[PDB]
Amino acid sequence: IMQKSNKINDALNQHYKLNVELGLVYAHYAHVADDEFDMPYLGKFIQHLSEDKLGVHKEYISDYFKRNGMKLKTDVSVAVKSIPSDAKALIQEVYARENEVRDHVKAIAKLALAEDDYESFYFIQWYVRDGLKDLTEVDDVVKLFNSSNDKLIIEETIKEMVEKEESEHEIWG
Amino acid sequence: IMQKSNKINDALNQHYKLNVELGLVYAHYAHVADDEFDMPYLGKFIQHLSEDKLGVHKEYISDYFKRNGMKLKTDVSVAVKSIPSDAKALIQEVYARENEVRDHVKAIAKLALAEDDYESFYFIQWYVRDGLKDLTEVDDVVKLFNSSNDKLIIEETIKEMVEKEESEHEIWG
Amino acid sequence: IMQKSNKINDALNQHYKLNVELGLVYAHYAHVADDEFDMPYLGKFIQHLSEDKLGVHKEYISDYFKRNGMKLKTDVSVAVKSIPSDAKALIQEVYARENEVRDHVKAIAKLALAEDDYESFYFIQWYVRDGLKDLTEVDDVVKLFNSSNDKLIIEETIKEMVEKEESEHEIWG
Amino acid sequence: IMQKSNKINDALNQHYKLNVELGLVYAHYAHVADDEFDMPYLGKFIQHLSEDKLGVHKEYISDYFKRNGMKLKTDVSVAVKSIPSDAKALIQEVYARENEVRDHVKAIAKLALAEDDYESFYFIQWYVRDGLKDLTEVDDVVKLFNSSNDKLIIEETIKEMVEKEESEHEIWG
Amino acid sequence: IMQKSNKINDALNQHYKLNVELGLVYAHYAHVADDEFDMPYLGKFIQHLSEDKLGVHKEYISDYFKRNGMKLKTDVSVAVKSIPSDAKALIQEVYARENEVRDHVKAIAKLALAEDDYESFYFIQWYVRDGLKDLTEVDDVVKLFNSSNDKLIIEETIKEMVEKEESEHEIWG
Amino acid sequence: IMQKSNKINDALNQHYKLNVELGLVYAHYAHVADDEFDMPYLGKFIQHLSEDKLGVHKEYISDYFKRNGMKLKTDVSVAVKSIPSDAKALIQEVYARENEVRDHVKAIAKLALAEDDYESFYFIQWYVRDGLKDLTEVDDVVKLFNSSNDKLIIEETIKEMVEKEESEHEIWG
Ligand SMILES: [Cl-]
Ligand SMILES: [Cl-]
Ligand SMILES: [Cl-]
Ligand SMILES: [Cl-]
Ligand SMILES: [Cl-]
Ligand SMILES: [Cl-]
Ligand SMILES: [Fe+3]
Ligand SMILES: [Fe+3]
Ligand SMILES: [Fe+3]
Ligand SMILES: [Fe+3]
Ligand SMILES: [Fe+3]
Ligand SMILES: [Fe+3]
Ligand SMILES: [Fe+3]
Ligand SMILES: [Fe+3]
Ligand SMILES: [Fe+3]
Ligand SMILES: [Fe+3]
Ligand SMILES: [Fe+3]
Ligand SMILES: [Fe+3]
Ligand SMILES: [Fe+3]
Ligand SMILES: [Fe+3]
Ligand SMILES: [Fe+3]
Ligand SMILES: [Fe+3]
Ligand SMILES: [Fe+3]
Ligand SMILES: [Fe+3]
Ligand SMILES: [Fe+3]
Ligand SMILES: [Fe+3]
Ligand SMILES: [Fe+3]
Ligand SMILES: [Fe+3]
Ligand SMILES: [Fe+3]
Ligand SMILES: [Fe+3]
Ligand SMILES: [Fe+3]
Ligand SMILES: [Fe+3]
Ligand SMILES: [Fe+3]
Ligand SMILES: [Fe+3]
Ligand SMILES: [Fe+3]
Ligand SMILES: [Fe+3]
Ligand SMILES: [Fe+3]
Ligand SMILES: [Fe+3]
Ligand SMILES: [Fe+3]
Ligand SMILES: [Fe+3]
Ligand SMILES: [Fe+3]
Ligand SMILES: [Fe+3]
Ligand SMILES: [Fe+3]
Ligand SMILES: [Fe+3]
Ligand SMILES: [Fe+3]
Ligand SMILES: [Fe+3]
Ligand SMILES: [Fe+3]
Ligand SMILES: [Fe+3]
Ligand SMILES: [Fe+3]
Ligand SMILES: [Fe+3]
Ligand SMILES: [Fe+3]
Ligand SMILES: [Fe+3]
Ligand SMILES: [Fe+3]
Ligand SMILES: [Fe+3]
Ligand SMILES: [Fe+3]
Ligand SMILES: [Fe+3]
Ligand SMILES: [Fe+3]
Ligand SMILES: [Fe+3]
Ligand SMILES: [Fe+3]
Ligand SMILES: [Fe+3]
Ligand SMILES: [Fe+3]
Ligand SMILES: [Fe+3]
Ligand SMILES: [Fe+3]
Ligand SMILES: [Fe+3]
Ligand SMILES: [Fe+3]
Ligand SMILES: [Fe+3]
Ligand SMILES: [Fe+3]
Ligand SMILES: [Fe+3]
Ligand SMILES: [Fe+3]
Ligand SMILES: [Fe+3]
Ligand SMILES: [Fe+3]
Ligand SMILES: [Fe+3]
Ligand SMILES: [Fe+3]
Ligand SMILES: [Fe+3]
Ligand SMILES: [Fe+3]
Ligand SMILES: [Fe+3]
Ligand SMILES: [Fe+3]
Ligand SMILES: [Fe+3]
Ligand SMILES: [Mg+2]
Ligand SMILES: [Mg+2]
Ligand SMILES: [Mg+2]
Ligand SMILES: [Mg+2]
Ligand SMILES: [Mg+2]
Ligand SMILES: [Mg+2]
Ligand SMILES: [Mg+2]
Ligand SMILES: [Mg+2]
Ligand SMILES: [Mg+2]
Ligand SMILES: [Mg+2]
Ligand SMILES: [Mg+2]
Ligand SMILES: [Mg+2]
């Protein structure tokens, strides 16, 4: 009884992979934001996102697998072979990748219902919520690049974003 | 003047890669220690080592590159396609990989002197020291598997290792 | 036994001289940043660098000489006969001088090894590390002049730099 | 209206120069007091005087110039090519130089009145007062060398002088 | 891989021996300073140096050997068969022995570089720094015997030296 | 009057020698307990005993000699040329040496009475008491090796022994 779903196991190993590789890309993007684009606060913002992906995002999957019999796979390949040409396109690329996260997570929730895997539907709610939360945080930074042409002004607003004391929204937080 | 050394830049990008990939392997090994071998404290020990490799070990290199003109490369490929057969061989494999870290770091220090790159010789001292420190921490766990045949006894000693309040040795710490 | 190296003694007297004269130039540059360029926070930043050069940078050499038999020489000549034409070129000139510090310090470390003077190699590590740290702090200010065209915006970021509570990096700090 | 006095501007640039060069001589004398004469507390006393000359003594002039249109000049040349033969003559030479400070400052106050430069007469009162205060502190050390022939006894009294908690005299302080 | 250097192992066993034997000589010299020369504070100063040599100086070597495979040897022979004739020559003999420590340590650092043993070069930096620090502390006491002919005056200065609250120099401390 | 006993002076110089040499042997045994036998807590236990022998055990004799005219001799020769084959025999050898301490101390007390040296009989009571106390502490560790065959179980009991807050027995403490 309660035999783990091979399809969910695959979908969650792929999401594990995605969060690792994304995290490594973001670590590179954070370096470049500071080093090439002269926006260390943008770099800190993107670095925080990198450690989020390589931290709880992947840890919760590993933890879940230990509880239910699913098998963990580590299979990672990512190379950063070109970077966006400026800081605005850098954060817009981060926005694009987060939007894809929401789409991947949606498929997993849909599959959990199809499989009548209610523990997995429950588990993925965290990622359903976090998909929109992370996108909103990235969206808040994208907006700055359309509200001013001064990189130091933008940097000052990002600084208060990343130094703000963590305050989670009642629903999305 | 003060043109960065291309050879050191390469050696440090390779060490960056090594710490990322090692960190990902250790994350898998930590999962398996708990999940397959029933040693969650061994898992916590190995997980702490994974976050060390994927944290300060790689961050200090990125930070160094920003200061001196060296270029960061992200090029990562690692797959965990077989695991050691039991917990003792698991930690012994971690020991083997840490011993190789010391050997890689030694080459970088030797090269920094060859290149008369004294900022890089200075920078790598942290990794010279940490090479032996991490090996010693791993060695302390390996020892347990030769001092008792009872996994719960071993687990209890590992627990106090990982829950001990961080105390750095005057030289190696 | 343990007869001090005349070559190191000369190289360190020359570095003592350099830090005195640099410190006096920076004191002038700080005056001009405020007085001519209307950037008092840039002035405070450069003044802090002046007191650093005329403080610990020279004091540690004098202290070192007392311990090992090296002779101190005071021979100082510096006149500020032209200034850069604007604040951006002012900080860029400070950047140029700090880059030369790294080059002078590198030669001293190389010479200490050549002389098998390991106390002097040890002593100069502080200056190896500080060469890059000071350059990085200056680099952070140079960057501002390329990220905004508004002197008050630049001044506000410099203000938080110089008023920030001193936080030393684990390696470079 | 309120056009700065070129004569005062010159006299104060010369006093700026004097305080820089004196400060550098005192730094050397402090080194020698400890290193050659075995009187580290005398060295600390003279070092404190060096940092006074290179600190507020020169900073107040730079600050004054920013407020009134006077131009700062940095033109510094000083070499310590012989030292007094013992500690008593060392402090007596410091006494001689401080006595000359009083004479230079007197001329500036006299000139400010001649120029009807009452802001400059006001400004120089600090230096009028400090001329006698510094001379008195130096005088207190000179006295010790005539009250005992034992360098350690002298050193113990100097120690309590320099370690005393700063207490400014109502008039001279 | 990472096979320990037999030459460094020998040099460090010899330094272990030196610190043990020195420590035992200093324990005797401390006894004599008090008992024969009536200078208990000089005795406390020399006793503190004895416990330093027999404490961390030797402990760090033993600790190092445990981490890297080097073998510890205990082979100790020392007899105090004559003592200096007075307190001044007593501390001057301590000065002579500390000067030899610096020379022994220099050889070990030179050998570590020759052996491309960068963990051992790192390890010995503590002894490079401490070689000069201990010599400076001894030098400070030697100086007293040339600054006064009164043993109680000398004793009072030594008392404040040994009772001073430990304050480490940024570089040498 | 009150002329010191040459026989007691000899017996106490020999006991001084014994405590030095024992202390050095124990320092080696502590290294080996950790390094070869994988029992770092046994190592800490034996290291504490080493510092006891090289600390108060010898210091009280030196102090005693200063008060009464006895002469201190430093004449030390000890080499550790073979070690016991396992941890149990290691602590059993420590037990054997402590048992001999009791026998040496007994002879000194007997001699003090024979010499009508009541200050020396008084002085040696500390060593009479400590002879049994140290033997009892060693005995408590020996016992563990007969109560379990698991080195980690033994190590856990030793850990609480050495980390216990010092509590002296009303008589033996
Ligand atoms: Cl199903
Ligand atoms: Cl090069
Ligand atoms: Cl030489
Ligand atoms: Cl006028
Ligand atoms: Cl080799
Ligand atoms: Cl008798
Ligand atoms: Fe840059
Ligand atoms: Fe930065
Ligand atoms: Fe977050
Ligand atoms: Fe978790
Ligand atoms: Fe699994
Ligand atoms: Fe590729
Ligand atoms: Fe790419
Ligand atoms: Fe940009
Ligand atoms: Fe664009
Ligand atoms: Fe589906
Ligand atoms: Fe997230
Ligand atoms: Fe299970
Ligand atoms: Fe668990
Ligand atoms: Fe750690
Ligand atoms: Fe960093
Ligand atoms: Fe780069
Ligand atoms: Fe593969
Ligand atoms: Fe594999
Ligand atoms: Fe197992
Ligand atoms: Fe096995
Ligand atoms: Fe090389
Ligand atoms: Fe590490
Ligand atoms: Fe237990
Ligand atoms: Fe327990
Ligand atoms: Fe103005
Ligand atoms: Fe101002
Ligand atoms: Fe600073
Ligand atoms: Fe200093
Ligand atoms: Fe000198
Ligand atoms: Fe000129
Ligand atoms: Fe110029
Ligand atoms: Fe400007
Ligand atoms: Fe311009
Ligand atoms: Fe050279
Ligand atoms: Fe600096
Ligand atoms: Fe603002
Ligand atoms: Fe603001
Ligand atoms: Fe000297
Ligand atoms: Fe000193
Ligand atoms: Fe003052
Ligand atoms: Fe001011
Ligand atoms: Fe001006
Ligand atoms: Fe000249
Ligand atoms: Fe001169
Ligand atoms: Fe003198
Ligand atoms: Fe004289
Ligand atoms: Fe006049
Ligand atoms: Fe003054
Ligand atoms: Fe006496
Ligand atoms: Fe006494
Ligand atoms: Fe000390
Ligand atoms: Fe240690
Ligand atoms: Fe060993
Ligand atoms: Fe002999
Ligand atoms: Fe001798
Ligand atoms: Fe004497
Ligand atoms: Fe004499
Ligand atoms: Fe060599
Ligand atoms: Fe020391
Ligand atoms: Fe006194
Ligand atoms: Fe006194
Ligand atoms: Fe081992
Ligand atoms: Fe250990
Ligand atoms: Fe004890
Ligand atoms: Fe005592
Ligand atoms: Fe005696
Ligand atoms: Fe022998
Ligand atoms: Fe033996
Ligand atoms: Fe054993
Ligand atoms: Fe046995
Ligand atoms: Fe008898
Ligand atoms: Fe005892
Ligand atoms: Mg399948
Ligand atoms: Mg259905
Ligand atoms: Mg290349
Ligand atoms: Mg070379
Ligand atoms: Mg010369
Ligand atoms: Mg050579
Ligand atoms: Mg003019
Ligand atoms: Mg008039
Ligand atoms: Mg050999
Ligand atoms: Mg070579
Ligand atoms: Mg006799
Ligand atoms: Mg009788």
PDB file of N, CA, C and O in Angstrom, chain C residues 118-161:
ATOM      1  N   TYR C 118      62.078  35.282   6.395  1.00  0.00           N
ATOM      2  CA  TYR C 118      60.708  34.823   6.599  1.00  0.00           C
ATOM      3  C   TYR C 118      59.940  35.692   7.599  1.00  0.00           C
ATOM      4  O   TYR C 118      58.728  35.871   7.439  1.00  0.00           O
ATOM      5  N   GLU C 119      60.609  36.290   8.589  1.00  0.00           N
ATOM      6  CA  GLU C 119      59.919  37.309   9.383  1.00  0.00           C
ATOM      7  C   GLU C 119      59.441  38.461   8.495  1.00  0.00           C
ATOM      8  O   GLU C 119      58.322  38.965   8.666  1.00  0.00           O
ATOM      9  N   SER C 120      60.265  38.890   7.526  1.00  0.00           N
ATOM     10  CA  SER C 120      59.815  39.957   6.634  1.00  0.00           C
ATOM     11  C   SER C 120      58.747  39.488   5.659  1.00  0.00           C
ATOM     12  O   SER C 120      57.858  40.269   5.317  1.00  0.00           O
ATOM     13  N   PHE C 121      58.816  38.248   5.177  1.00  0.00           N
ATOM     14  CA  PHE C 121      57.705  37.747   4.373  1.00  0.00           C
ATOM     15  C   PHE C 121      56.421  37.719   5.195  1.00  0.00           C
ATOM     16  O   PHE C 121      55.348  38.104   4.709  1.00  0.00           O
ATOM     17  N   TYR C 122      56.520  37.282   6.454  1.00  0.00           N
ATOM     18  CA  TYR C 122      55.351  37.283   7.323  1.00  0.00           C
ATOM     19  C   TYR C 122      54.830  38.702   7.515  1.00  0.00           C
ATOM     20  O   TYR C 122      53.649  38.979   7.286  1.00  0.00           O
ATOM     21  N   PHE C 123      55.714  39.620   7.899  1.00  0.00           N
ATOM     22  CA  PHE C 123      55.318  41.006   8.138  1.00  0.00           C
ATOM     23  C   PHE C 123      54.585  41.611   6.936  1.00  0.00           C
ATOM     24  O   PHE C 123      53.557  42.286   7.092  1.00  0.00           O
ATOM     25  N   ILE C 124      55.098  41.382   5.724  1.00  0.00           N
ATOM     26  CA  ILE C 124      54.535  42.037   4.544  1.00  0.00           C
ATOM     27  C   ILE C 124      53.182  41.470   4.125  1.00  0.00           C
ATOM     28  O   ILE C 124      52.489  42.092   3.304  1.00  0.00           O
ATOM     29  N   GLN C 125      52.776  40.313   4.661  1.00  0.00           N
ATOM     30  CA  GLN C 125      51.468  39.769   4.299  1.00  0.00           C
ATOM     31  C   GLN C 125      50.361  40.761   4.618  1.00  0.00           C
ATOM     32  O   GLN C 125      49.397  40.891   3.852  1.00  0.00           O
ATOM     33  N   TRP C 126      50.495  41.492   5.731  1.00  0.00           N
ATOM     34  CA  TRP C 126      49.520  42.528   6.071  1.00  0.00           C
ATOM     35  C   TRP C 126      49.387  43.531   4.937  1.00  0.00           C
ATOM     36  O   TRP C 126      48.275  43.942   4.580  1.00  0.00           O
ATOM     37  N   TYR C 127      50.519  43.925   4.355  1.00  0.00           N
ATOM     38  CA  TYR C 127      50.510  44.869   3.246  1.00  0.00           C
ATOM     39  C   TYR C 127      50.073  44.214   1.938  1.00  0.00           C
ATOM     40  O   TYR C 127      49.472  44.877   1.091  1.00  0.00           O
ATOM     41  N   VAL C 128      50.363  42.928   1.748  1.00  0.00           N
ATOM     42  CA  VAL C 128      49.799  42.221   0.596  1.00  0.00           C
ATOM     43  C   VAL C 128      48.279  42.263   0.657  1.00  0.00           C
ATOM     44  O   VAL C 128      47.607  42.656  -0.306  1.00  0.00           O
ATOM     45  N   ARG C 129      47.717  41.879   1.803  1.00  0.00           N
ATOM     46  CA  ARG C 129      46.268  41.890   1.947  1.00  0.00           C
ATOM     47  C   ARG C 129      45.718  43.307   1.828  1.00  0.00           C
ATOM     48  O   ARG C 129      44.724  43.549   1.131  1.00  0.00           O
ATOM     49  N   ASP C 130      46.365  44.261   2.490  1.00  0.00           N
ATOM     50  CA  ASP C 130      45.817  45.611   2.521  1.00  0.00           C
ATOM     51  C   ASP C 130      45.922  46.298   1.166  1.00  0.00           C
ATOM     52  O   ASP C 130      45.112  47.185   0.861  1.00  0.00           O
ATOM     53  N   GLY C 131      46.917  45.916   0.358  1.00  0.00           N
ATOM     54  CA  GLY C 131      47.019  46.460  -0.987  1.00  0.00           C
ATOM     55  C   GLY C 131      45.753  46.244  -1.792  1.00  0.00           C
ATOM     56  O   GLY C 131      45.245  47.169  -2.440  1.00  0.00           O
ATOM     57  N   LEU C 132      45.199  45.038  -1.726  1.00  0.00           N
ATOM     58  CA  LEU C 132      43.976  44.754  -2.466  1.00  0.00           C
ATOM     59  C   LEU C 132      42.743  45.352  -1.780  1.00  0.00           C
ATOM     60  O   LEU C 132      41.835  45.850  -2.458  1.00  0.00           O
ATOM     61  N   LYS C 133      42.698  45.327  -0.445  1.00  0.00           N
ATOM     62  CA  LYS C 133      41.558  45.891   0.284  1.00  0.00           C
ATOM     63  C   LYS C 133      41.380  47.378  -0.007  1.00  0.00           C
ATOM     64  O   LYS C 133      40.276  47.829  -0.340  1.00  0.00           O
ATOM     65  N   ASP C 134      42.453  48.163   0.152  1.00  0.00           N
ATOM     66  CA  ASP C 134      42.364  49.591  -0.137  1.00  0.00           C
ATOM     67  C   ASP C 134      41.986  49.838  -1.595  1.00  0.00           C
ATOM     68  O   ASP C 134      41.181  50.726  -1.887  1.00  0.00           O
ATOM     69  N   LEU C 135      42.574  49.076  -2.529  1.00  0.00           N
ATOM     70  CA  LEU C 135      42.204  49.238  -3.935  1.00  0.00           C
ATOM     71  C   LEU C 135      40.716  48.976  -4.153  1.00  0.00           C
ATOM     72  O   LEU C 135      40.068  49.652  -4.961  1.00  0.00           O
ATOM     73  N   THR C 136      40.163  47.983  -3.450  1.00  0.00           N
ATOM     74  CA  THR C 136      38.755  47.636  -3.612  1.00  0.00           C
ATOM     75  C   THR C 136      37.861  48.740  -3.072  1.00  0.00           C
ATOM     76  O   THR C 136      36.829  49.063  -3.676  1.00  0.00           O
ATOM     77  N   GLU C 137      38.238  49.324  -1.930  1.00  0.00           N
ATOM     78  CA  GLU C 137      37.469  50.437  -1.391  1.00  0.00           C
ATOM     79  C   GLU C 137      37.502  51.617  -2.345  1.00  0.00           C
ATOM     80  O   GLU C 137      36.466  52.229  -2.617  1.00  0.00           O
ATOM     81  N   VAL C 138      38.677  51.935  -2.892  1.00  0.00           N
ATOM     82  CA  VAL C 138      38.744  53.012  -3.880  1.00  0.00           C
ATOM     83  C   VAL C 138      37.934  52.647  -5.120  1.00  0.00           C
ATOM     84  O   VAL C 138      37.242  53.495  -5.700  1.00  0.00           O
ATOM     85  N   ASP C 139      38.000  51.378  -5.539  1.00  0.00           N
ATOM     86  CA  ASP C 139      37.274  50.951  -6.731  1.00  0.00           C
ATOM     87  C   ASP C 139      35.777  51.159  -6.557  1.00  0.00           C
ATOM     88  O   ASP C 139      35.086  51.553  -7.500  1.00  0.00           O
ATOM     89  N   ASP C 140      35.268  50.894  -5.353  1.00  0.00           N
ATOM     90  CA  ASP C 140      33.848  51.065  -5.076  1.00  0.00           C
ATOM     91  C   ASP C 140      33.399  52.511  -5.274  1.00  0.00           C
ATOM     92  O   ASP C 140      32.258  52.752  -5.673  1.00  0.00           O
ATOM     93  N   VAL C 141      34.274  53.481  -5.004  1.00  0.00           N
ATOM     94  CA  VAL C 141      33.937  54.890  -5.218  1.00  0.00           C
ATOM     95  C   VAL C 141      34.042  55.263  -6.699  1.00  0.00           C
ATOM     96  O   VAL C 141      33.183  55.970  -7.242  1.00  0.00           O
ATOM     97  N   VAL C 142      35.111  54.821  -7.366  1.00  0.00           N
ATOM     98  CA  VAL C 142      35.243  55.043  -8.808  1.00  0.00           C
ATOM     99  C   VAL C 142      33.986  54.596  -9.534  1.00  0.00           C
ATOM    100  O   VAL C 142      33.503  55.270 -10.453  1.00  0.00           O
ATOM    101  N   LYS C 143      33.461  53.457  -9.184  1.00  0.00           N
ATOM    102  CA  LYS C 143      32.285  52.932  -9.831  1.00  0.00           C
ATOM    103  C   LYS C 143      31.120  53.896  -9.812  1.00  0.00           C
ATOM    104  O   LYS C 143      30.408  53.999 -10.789  1.00  0.00           O
ATOM    105  N   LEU C 144      30.940  54.609  -8.713  1.00  0.00           N
ATOM    106  CA  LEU C 144      29.801  55.511  -8.582  1.00  0.00           C
ATOM    107  C   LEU C 144      29.795  56.557  -9.684  1.00  0.00           C
ATOM    108  O   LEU C 144      28.731  56.906 -10.210  1.00  0.00           O
ATOM    109  N   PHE C 145      30.981  57.062 -10.056  1.00  0.00           N
ATOM    110  CA  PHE C 145      31.062  58.113 -11.060  1.00  0.00           C
ATOM    111  C   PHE C 145      30.694  57.608 -12.449  1.00  0.00           C
ATOM    112  O   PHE C 145      30.423  58.421 -13.338  1.00  0.00           O
ATOM    113  N   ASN C 146      30.656  56.295 -12.654  1.00  0.00           N
ATOM    114  CA  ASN C 146      30.172  55.743 -13.911  1.00  0.00           C
ATOM    115  C   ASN C 146      28.726  55.284 -13.835  1.00  0.00           C
ATOM    116  O   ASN C 146      28.144  54.941 -14.867  1.00  0.00           O
ATOM    117  N   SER C 147      28.126  55.277 -12.643  1.00  0.00           N
ATOM    118  CA  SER C 147      26.752  54.834 -12.485  1.00  0.00           C
ATOM    119  C   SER C 147      25.767  55.984 -12.347  1.00  0.00           C
ATOM    120  O   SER C 147      24.558  55.742 -12.366  1.00  0.00           O
ATOM    121  N   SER C 148      26.238  57.218 -12.199  1.00  0.00           N
ATOM    122  CA  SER C 148      25.300  58.326 -12.134  1.00  0.00           C
ATOM    123  C   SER C 148      26.043  59.588 -12.534  1.00  0.00           C
ATOM    124  O   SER C 148      27.267  59.664 -12.415  1.00  0.00           O
ATOM    125  N   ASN C 149      25.291  60.560 -13.043  1.00  0.00           N
ATOM    126  CA  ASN C 149      25.821  61.863 -13.420  1.00  0.00           C
ATOM    127  C   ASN C 149      25.469  62.937 -12.398  1.00  0.00           C
ATOM    128  O   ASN C 149      25.764  64.117 -12.610  1.00  0.00           O
ATOM    129  N   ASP C 150      24.852  62.552 -11.289  1.00  0.00           N
ATOM    130  CA  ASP C 150      24.374  63.487 -10.284  1.00  0.00           C
ATOM    131  C   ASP C 150      25.303  63.417  -9.081  1.00  0.00           C
ATOM    132  O   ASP C 150      25.389  62.376  -8.423  1.00  0.00           O
ATOM    133  N   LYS C 151      25.983  64.529  -8.788  1.00  0.00           N
ATOM    134  CA  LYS C 151      26.978  64.517  -7.722  1.00  0.00           C
ATOM    135  C   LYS C 151      26.354  64.283  -6.355  1.00  0.00           C
ATOM    136  O   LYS C 151      26.981  63.648  -5.499  1.00  0.00           O
ATOM    137  N   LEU C 152      25.131  64.785  -6.121  1.00  0.00           N
ATOM    138  CA  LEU C 152      24.474  64.536  -4.837  1.00  0.00           C
ATOM    139  C   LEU C 152      24.076  63.069  -4.681  1.00  0.00           C
ATOM    140  O   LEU C 152      24.164  62.510  -3.581  1.00  0.00           O
ATOM    141  N   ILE C 153      23.646  62.420  -5.760  1.00  0.00           N
ATOM    142  CA  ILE C 153      23.364  60.988  -5.675  1.00  0.00           C
ATOM    143  C   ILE C 153      24.635  60.224  -5.326  1.00  0.00           C
ATOM    144  O   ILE C 153      24.641  59.357  -4.447  1.00  0.00           O
ATOM    145  N   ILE C 154      25.734  60.542  -6.016  1.00  0.00           N
ATOM    146  CA  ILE C 154      27.013  59.911  -5.708  1.00  0.00           C
ATOM    147  C   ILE C 154      27.393  60.172  -4.255  1.00  0.00           C
ATOM    148  O   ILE C 154      27.769  59.250  -3.517  1.00  0.00           O
ATOM    149  N   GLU C 155      27.248  61.428  -3.815  1.00  0.00           N
ATOM    150  CA  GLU C 155      27.606  61.802  -2.448  1.00  0.00           C
ATOM    151  C   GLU C 155      26.809  60.997  -1.425  1.00  0.00           C
ATOM    152  O   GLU C 155      27.334  60.620  -0.366  1.00  0.00           O
ATOM    153  N   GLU C 156      25.538  60.716  -1.720  1.00  0.00           N
ATOM    154  CA  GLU C 156      24.737  59.983  -0.749  1.00  0.00           C
ATOM    155  C   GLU C 156      25.230  58.545  -0.612  1.00  0.00           C
ATOM    156  O   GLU C 156      25.268  58.002   0.494  1.00  0.00           O
ATOM    157  N   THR C 157      25.652  57.921  -1.711  1.00  0.00           N
ATOM    158  CA  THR C 157      26.201  56.575  -1.594  1.00  0.00           C
ATOM    159  C   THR C 157      27.550  56.582  -0.878  1.00  0.00           C
ATOM    160  O   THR C 157      27.812  55.712  -0.039  1.00  0.00           O
ATOM    161  N   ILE C 158      28.412  57.567  -1.158  1.00  0.00           N
ATOM    162  CA  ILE C 158      29.682  57.646  -0.436  1.00  0.00           C
ATOM    163  C   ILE C 158      29.439  57.828   1.061  1.00  0.00           C
ATOM    164  O   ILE C 158      30.142  57.249   1.901  1.00  0.00           O
ATOM    165  N   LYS C 159      28.445  58.640   1.418  1.00  0.00           N
ATOM    166  CA  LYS C 159      28.160  58.876   2.829  1.00  0.00           C
ATOM    167  C   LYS C 159      27.905  57.562   3.558  1.00  0.00           C
ATOM    168  O   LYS C 159      28.471  57.316   4.626  1.00  0.00           O
ATOM    169  N   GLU C 160      27.082  56.685   2.980  1.00  0.00           N
ATOM    170  CA  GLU C 160      26.821  55.424   3.662  1.00  0.00           C
ATOM    171  C   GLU C 160      28.043  54.511   3.644  1.00  0.00           C
ATOM    172  O   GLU C 160      28.231  53.725   4.577  1.00  0.00           O
ATOM    173  N   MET C 161      28.904  54.630   2.632  1.00  0.00           N
ATOM    174  CA  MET C 161      30.184  53.921   2.663  1.00  0.00           C
ATOM    175  C   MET C 161      31.032  54.337   3.865  1.00  0.00           C
ATOM    176  O   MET C 161      31.512  53.487   4.621  1.00  0.00           O
TER     177      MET C 161
END
